């Protein structure tokens, strides 16, 4: 027999209750596999619906601790004068070294925040 109704359940549940009925005599070749090692989500159909009101998507807009000093380097100076590659693992940009020459200084270096750029203003030419 079988069922062709993809809305009314998973293809597991649309089969494991058809072997209890006895409408398909032969045990399908994926059934005794999926029963043993099943997916973490049962693939039941759900109709996708749109958020209408005060329900924004719960994802997080990711931000990292070193974004501030990264942002100012693209403000007070230019972009990367050196070009990017992004093919090699661990590329250290002229900003990526610049954020690491910031993040030694604090913790408890803590002179002034503008001054923390003044100390690292000198060091990169040296």
């Amino acid at each position: 027999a079988g069922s062709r109704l993809e809305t009314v359940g998973s293809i597991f549940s649309r089969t494991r209750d058809l072997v209890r009925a006895g409408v398909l005599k032969e045990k399908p070749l994926w059934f005794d596999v999926y029963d043993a090692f099943p997916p973490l989500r049962e693939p039941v159909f759900q109709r996708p619906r749109v958020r209408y009101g005060k329900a924004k998507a719960p994802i997080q807009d990711i931000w990292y601790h070193e974004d501030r000093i990264r942002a100012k380097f693209y403000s007070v100076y230019g972009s990367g004068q050196r070009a990017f590659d992004l093919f090699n693992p661990n590329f250290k940009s002229t900003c990526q070294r610049f954020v690491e020459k910031y993040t030694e200084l604090q913790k408890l270096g803590e002179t002034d925040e503008e001054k923390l750029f003044v100390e690292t203003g000198k060091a990169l030419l040296a």
Binding site: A1, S3, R20, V23
Partner: protein, 108 residues
């Protein structure tokens, strides 16, 4: 050879055609089950009556639900469904009551 089909509706339905004028076709709706929990229904149509009858009988066994029941007589609980405009109210009942329900729901 253990299923059986019952007709639920026969409807002389019509469309209109540029050359043909008026065109009759027969829209049938069948229910198919076997006892034992598995049942299904389908609609099929053709111009001929025997042609529509075979078309829905041979299609309803590809769309069949397993209707999970209580022990043989009844269902699991009270349900109260509203389906597009149709309120249906259907109640769990003890053994030997009988099917006091709409005459289409009798045959299903």
């Amino acid at each position: 050879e253990d299923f059986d089909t019952r007709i639920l509706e026969v409807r002389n339905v019509f469309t209109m055609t540029a050359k043909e004028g008026r065109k009759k076709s027969i829209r049938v709706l069948v229910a198919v089950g076997n006892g034992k929990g598995a049942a299904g229904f389908s609609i099929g149509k053709a111009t001929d009556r025997m042609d529509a009858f075979r078309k829905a009988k041979n299609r309803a066994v590809h769309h069949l639900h397993y209707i999970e029941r209580y022990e043989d007589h009844t269902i699991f609980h009270d349900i109260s469904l509203r389906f597009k405009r149709t309120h249906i109210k259907m109640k769990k009942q003890p053994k030997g009551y009988g099917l006091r329900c709409h005459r289409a729901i009798i045959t299903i």
